[PDB]
Design an enzyme around this catalytic site. Structure first.
Site, short mmCIF file in Angstrom:
data_model
loop_
_atom_site.label_atom_id
_atom_site.label_comp_id
_atom_site.label_asym_id
_atom_site.label_seq_id
_atom_site.Cartn_x
_atom_site.Cartn_y
_atom_site.Cartn_z
N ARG B 362 116.30 41.37 78.38
CA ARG B 362 115.07 42.66 78.49
C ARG B 362 114.09 42.38 79.49
O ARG B 362 113.70 43.09 80.17
CB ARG B 362 114.66 42.71 76.95
CG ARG B 362 115.61 42.71 75.80
CD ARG B 362 114.81 42.76 74.37
NE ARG B 362 115.45 43.45 73.43
CZ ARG B 362 116.30 43.03 72.38
NH1 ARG B 362 116.42 41.65 72.46
NH2 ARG B 362 116.80 43.83 71.48
N1 LIG Z 1 118.20 53.34 78.00
C1 LIG Z 1 118.64 52.22 78.33
N2 LIG Z 1 119.23 51.96 79.59
C2 LIG Z 1 119.44 50.71 79.89
N3 LIG Z 1 119.48 49.72 79.05
C3 LIG Z 1 118.86 49.86 77.80
C4 LIG Z 1 118.51 51.21 77.43
N4 LIG Z 1 118.14 51.24 76.13
C5 LIG Z 1 118.14 50.11 75.74
N5 LIG Z 1 118.73 48.93 76.71
C6 LIG Z 1 118.80 47.52 76.81
O1 LIG Z 1 119.02 47.12 75.38
C7 LIG Z 1 117.66 46.27 74.93
C8 LIG Z 1 117.45 46.88 73.68
O2 LIG Z 1 116.00 47.41 73.67
P1 LIG Z 1 114.83 47.52 72.64
O3 LIG Z 1 113.81 46.62 72.77
O4 LIG Z 1 114.49 49.26 72.61
O5 LIG Z 1 115.76 47.35 71.25
P2 LIG Z 1 115.84 47.50 69.88
O6 LIG Z 1 117.05 48.04 69.44
O7 LIG Z 1 114.63 48.47 69.45
O8 LIG Z 1 115.46 46.08 69.25
P3 LIG Z 1 114.54 45.23 68.45
O9 LIG Z 1 115.18 45.09 67.07
O10 LIG Z 1 114.17 43.86 68.92
O11 LIG Z 1 113.44 46.09 68.17
C9 LIG Z 1 116.84 46.74 76.25
O12 LIG Z 1 115.93 45.58 76.44
C10 LIG Z 1 117.88 46.80 77.38
O13 LIG Z 1 118.32 45.61 77.40
#
Ligand SMILES: Nc1ncnc2c1ncn2[C@@H]1O[C@H](COP(=O)(O)OP(=O)(O)OP(=O)(O)O)[C@@H](O)[C@H]1O
Ligand SMILES: Nc1ncnc2c1ncn2[C@@H]1O[C@H](COP(=O)(O)OP(=O)(O)OP(=O)(O)O)[C@@H](O)[C@H]1O
Ligand SMILES: [Mg+2]
Ligand SMILES: [Mg+2]
Lengths: 47, 506, 464, 114
Positions: B362
């Site tokens: 990330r």
């Molecule tokens: N639209 C996108 N395009 C490209 N990569 C993405 C996208 N959305 C997510 N990712 C990838 O997936 C990762 C997950 O992002 P995010 O921090 O929103 O996760 P989360 O599911 O909310 O997790 P957490 O439980 O830690 O909050 C991002 O850091 C990136 O690596």
């Protein structure tokens, strides 16, 4: 020849699906054991 | 009437000694010690230590740290006066210590600068800074595809024998070039925390770091599988405290927790022994906190606080590569990315078994140097699409020209990311290596030789054309002039390279 | 007069008072920790009356270093946070102490973080669509202006990236105020959001209340109430429209579960507090929009172990006017925003609200995707080649629909580098009407991947 | 066999055998299709569907579940009908003819109505 290839692919996919479902069934088996023990020992602690 | 005064007087009245009244499998209850602090460190007669977790009105329930076999009813427990804390300082570099900071390598005692509490709050939102400088792991796959920046939390997650310690030991070894610079803004100090790992594996890791010259900046916090749950529960926290003392002094630290699923098991044991009702998979509700509390202290501090950083490479040992289990999901939701090492890839000789697809960083990208980001920009998508296309073509009756070209490029990219253990590569060598593949210079080399062709080629550049490496290292960018020189050197080398198949690779 | 600390069990502290001075529930008490580096003014919140003049309290800061017998003084009022226009543009913790300016907000009007939800007579349903520009959200899960929206998803599926995306799409051009409440997300993410909002100049219109993971469960469960109190002030008093981003409200329930375990309450189904539904209702019913003054709320809901039957998500599902359930399976295929088109839903996807054309297209897309899901088990073994020719066609256009619901999000630029795109609602409806009718089932599937529109669809088709 | 007689026991055990084979095959049929089964197994599946539907009966207490009145089938007629099914004498009749009928006469009448 295409039937041979398609059925080999089907057998491989079925084996992978069996592995995935077995891993799952093991997860729910362990989870059921845990949950049952949690209920039993929660009743025990309260009594 | 006078009872209230008389009773009050008593409370008021309170080198003070308590006595153990209960004791069992890690938990000991101590009556007395009216002035003990919560999380205070209590020393029992045999030199054993414990943490005063519960402070009831009556006795105090403490988790024994170490040989709980020597705790018996009636023993005298005396305060240390220090909340749960460990000694810290530069004297810890090159030492193996137990979770309490007591040396266990057989060398002399450690001259601690001071004592740091294990439960100090992490830097706040305003005290941090965007992760902006890279932590070169020396692994081509990690530094090209899922780069790690200083201050990042990168989760090395995988099954047993998937190559996870190595990916951490290689990361620690790759910091020797930075260490030899002498610049605190470049030196990366390492704290390898072994939780529940075999003693022989800790010895191996120490041997590898010594033969790689990495112990002079690495600290090993050992809580082997033989130690009680208390040590396996504190080891990450003492490691993070050793690292934090350096982080807040401006130094850059790299903390490796190997492996946090064993800390979770130890904490589960302690909790269940305290009779705390468990939740999912028998873990307590605090199990997330346990880790979120720990990995939140790995941060890139703002320039107001010296600009130091602590990078964390927590390791998680999934079972049957189930990345959706409880503890793995907790740590994924805590950390800034995961390097998912698959056992399927690793058994078939793809080592480091980085599954390109699920693996991600990330916070990276901003930290990756310009040259690596330019050469390796398309690598991740190419590799993922190559895996999917290879799965498709395994049973297709024919492959188009474009499909076959993609398959051939992907095979050589995979063989190029393949790397031997305890052989980390400097960032410039990685830049050149990924340049060889992403630009098609490997298409003329048989797949089986890609490892050698690459491995020898870098040697030639180190021996005869170091200007390319020096340029990449200094300006952090692969200039077009240097690019043309590198292409010329590649072509010149391919003329003299002896392929295994005999056919010329030109 | 003051009390004494009698028992300490982690972040839960029992304090004894004289018979005539036992504090009321939710009162804020102050204790002193005087040891070295841990010295602090510990803020406790009364949670129970245990009798014999003892009250059990939840510590807001870690209790580390606290000693039995230390004086505890009750303030006579619950944890109060600053409220006002001056709150906008600053970062606070669960206790109202500003982080950028440590002494800021000490002289503002202060409001208790505990208050009754608006009376039932003040509530009216919201049914106005909020156009975000995301194809999947606008078509299958229309968000409600003034409604309650949620983003469910396991670990690492894109909840935070969607929260950033909706800040960039809703909050960026929003006329009213905004409130972001970290409730147990990364402190790194909080700092990133702070710098991003400062860069976009949206900070001046938004108030941030973080209380992130490293905090103990007390603050981790009261930070949501603090931020919601700021939002409630902006709603009731200033008459502004309010955006209330919560990241993530499962961490409020998890902190509640930890506290309940420490408070001695018997565990519920899977270890959660018995009051789980009660506490979640107390928090959520306050986030409602009243009659003439709207509070649009968007909440990330972490689902532990990707279990959407876990009691916390199962409890929070009933509080939402729109739900976007992110799926690991959709994520693993590269289909960002990773929405599960079949599990996600909205209460305004009703022909009376979104129109007959929108409803028809959405329901046809859902039918195609459901039939694809029903065939998935056969597709796993034998592949599309064994299906009938009405299902084979359906499966092809279902794959194209599934990949077209993906979008190059504006927040995804930092990861991919590809700039974001916004698709207007009418164009989304037209595009999916065409896809369901088979007007695009000859293009390659990758042509629909992370494209965002019909013009871009044609452009990428060519490129392929 | 010592209590219900050898004929009743044989018919019951053959019905159970056919139904168990059908239960084992249902996994295959739902994915690979009936056309890929053996000829003997295909015939057995057609037998088993009719046997399952013939075990259904319009009971008197379920008149308000189906509208039609209840029926009573003598044990001898049940044994004869199931021996015929398991042996094949009814493979030509449609399977829906065996649903909620209760007896051979009802089977013939419903088959004619189909
Ligand atoms: N639209 C996108 N395009 C490209 N990569 C993405 C996208 N959305 C997510 N990712 C990838 O997936 C990762 C997950 O992002 P995010 O921090 O929103 O996760 P989360 O599911 O909310 O997790 P957490 O439980 O830690 O909050 C991002 O850091 C990136 O690596
Ligand atoms: N890059 C590599 N190339 C070749 N062999 C490797 C590589 N990395 C690791 N190995 C070998 O794989 C084996 C497993 O490695 P390692 O111990 O590092 O994995 P691990 O995840 O620590 O396993 P565990 O922790 O469960 O013991 C070791 O013998 C190691 O030497
Ligand atoms: Mg290992
Ligand atoms: Mg997040």
């Amino acid at each position: 020849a295409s039937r041979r290839r398609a059925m080999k692919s089907a057998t491989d996919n079925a084996d992978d699906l069996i592995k995935a479902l077995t891993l799952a069934a093991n997860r729910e088996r362990q989870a059921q054991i845990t949950q049952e023990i949690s209920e039993i020992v929660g009743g025990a602690n309260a009594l | 009437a006078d009872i209230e005064g008389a009773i009050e007087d008593y409370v008021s009245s309170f080198e003070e000694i308590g006595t153990v009244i209960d004791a069992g499998d890690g938990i000991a209850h101590v009556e007395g010690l009216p002035s003990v602090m919560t999380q205070e460190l209590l020393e029992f007669p045999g030199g054993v230590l414990g943490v005063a977790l519960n402070l009831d009105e009556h006795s105090v329930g403490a988790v024994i740290l170490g040989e709980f076999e020597k705790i018996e009813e009636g023993q005298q427990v005396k305060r240390t006066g220090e909340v749960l804390s460990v000694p810290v300082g530069d004297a810890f570099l090159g030492r193996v210590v137990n979770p309490l900071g007591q040396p266990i390598d057989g060398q002399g005692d450690i001259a601690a600068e001071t004592r740091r509490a294990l439960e100090l709050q992490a830097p706040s939102v305003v005290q941090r800074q965007s992760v902006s400088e890279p932590l070169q792991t020396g692994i081509k796959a990690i530094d090209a595809m899922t780069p790690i920046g200083r201050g990042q939390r990168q989760l090395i997650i995988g099954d047993r024998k998937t190559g996870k310690t190595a990916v951490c030991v290689d990361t620690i070894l790759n910091q020797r070039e930075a260490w030899l610079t002498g610049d605190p803004k470049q030196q990366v100090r390492c704290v390898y925390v072994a939780i529940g790992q075999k003693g022989t594996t800790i010895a191996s890791v120490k041997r590898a770091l010594e033969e790689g010259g990495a112990m002079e900046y690495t600290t090993i916090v050992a809580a082997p599988a033989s130690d009680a749950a208390g040590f396996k529960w504190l080891a990450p926290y003492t490691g993070s405290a050793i690292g934090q003392h350096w982080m807040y002094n401006g130094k850059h630290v790299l903390i490796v927790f190997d492996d946090l699923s064993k800390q979770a098991d130890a904490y589960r044991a302690i909790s269940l022994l305290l009779r705390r009702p468990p939740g999912r998979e028998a873990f307590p509700g605090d199990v997330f906190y346990l880790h979120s509390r720990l990995l939140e202290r790995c941060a890139k501090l703002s320039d107001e606080l010296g600009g130091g950083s602590m990078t964390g490479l927590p390791i998680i040992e999934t079972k049957a590569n189930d990345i959706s289990a409880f503890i793995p999901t907790n740590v994924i939701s805590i950390t800034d990315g995961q390097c998912f090492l698959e056992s399927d890839l690793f058994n078939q000789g793809v080592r480091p078994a980085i599954n390109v697809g699920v693996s991600v960083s990330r916070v990276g990208g901003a930290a990756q140097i310009k040259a690596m980001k330019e050469v390796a920009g398309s690598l991740r998508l190419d590799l993922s699409q190559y895996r999917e296309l290879e799965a498709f073509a395994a049973f297709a009756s024919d492959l188009d020209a474009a499909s076959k070209a993609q398959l051939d490029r992907g095979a050589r990219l995979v063989e190029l990311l393949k790397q031997p253990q305890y052989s980390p590569l400097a960032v410039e060598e990685q830049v050149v290596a990924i340049f060889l593949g992403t630009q098609g210079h490997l298409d003329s080399v048989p797949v089986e030789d890609v490892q050698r062709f690459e491995s020898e080629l870098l040697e030639h550049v180190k021996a005869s054309h170091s200007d390319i490496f020096d340029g990449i290292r200094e300006t952090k960018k692969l200039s077009e002039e240097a690019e043309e020189k590198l292409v010329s050197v590649i072509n010149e080398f391919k003329k003299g390279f002896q392929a295994s198949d005999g056919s010329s690779v030109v | 007069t003051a009390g004494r600390v009698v028992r300490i069990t982690g972040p839960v502290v029992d304090v004894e008072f004289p018979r005539g001075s036992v504090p009321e529930l939710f009162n804020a008490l102050h204790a002193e920790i005087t040891f070295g580096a841990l010295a602090k003014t510990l803020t406790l919140e009364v949670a129970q009356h245990l009798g014999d003049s003892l009250v059990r309290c939840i510590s807001m800061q870690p209790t580390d270093g606290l000693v039995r017998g230390v004086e505890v003084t009750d303030t006579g009022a619950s944890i109060s946070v600053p409220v006002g226009d001056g709150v906008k543009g600053h970062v606070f913790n669960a206790l109202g102490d500003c982080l950028d300016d440590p002494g800021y907000g000490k002289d503002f009007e202060h409001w208790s973080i505990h208050r009754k939800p608006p009376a039932f007579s003040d509530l009216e349903p919201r049914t106005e669509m909020l156009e975000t520009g995301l194809k999947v959200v606008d078509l299958l899960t229309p968000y409600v202006r003034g409604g309650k929206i949620a983003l469910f998803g396991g670990a690492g599926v894109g909840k935070t990236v969607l929260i950033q995306e909706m800040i960039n799409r809703i909050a960026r051009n929003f006329g009213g105020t905004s409130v972001f409440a970290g409730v147990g997300e990364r402190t790194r993410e909080g700092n990133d959001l702070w710098v991003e909002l400062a860069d976009a100049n949206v900070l001046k219109d938004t108030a941030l209340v973080f209380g992130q993971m490293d905090e103990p469960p007390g603050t981790r469960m009261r930070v949501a109430l603090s931020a919601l109190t700021m939002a409630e002030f902006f709603r009731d008093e200033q008459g502004q429209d309010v955006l209330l981003f919560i990241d993530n409200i499962f961490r409020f329930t998890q902190a509640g579960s930890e506290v309940s375990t420490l408070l001695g309450r018997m565990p519920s189904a899977v270890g959660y507090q018995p009051t789980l539904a009660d506490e979640m209702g107390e928090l959520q019913e306050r986030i409602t929009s009243t009659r003439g003054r709207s509070i649009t709320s968007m909440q990330a809901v972490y689902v532990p172990a990707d279990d959407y039957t876990d009691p916390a998500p199962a409890t929070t599902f009933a509080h939402l006017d729109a739900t976007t359930e992110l799926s690991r399976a959709v994520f693993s295929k590269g289909i960002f925003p990773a929405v599960d088109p079949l599990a996600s839903s909205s209460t305004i996807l009703d022909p009376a609200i979104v129109g007959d054309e929108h409803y028809r297209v959405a329901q046809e897309v859902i039918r195609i995707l459901q039939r694809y899901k029903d065939l998935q088990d056969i597709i796993a073994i034998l592949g599309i080649d064994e299906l009938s020719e009405e299902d084979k066609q359906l499966v092809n256009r279902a794959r194209r629909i599934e990949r077209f619901l993906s979008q190059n999000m504006m927040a995804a630029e930092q990861f991919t580098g590809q700039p974001g795109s916004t698709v207007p609602l009418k164009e989304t409806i037209e595009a999916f009407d065409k896809l369901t009718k088979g007007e695009f089932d000859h293009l390659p599937e990758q042509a629909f991947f992370l494209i965002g529109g019909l013009d871009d669809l044609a452009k990428k088709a060519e490129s392929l």
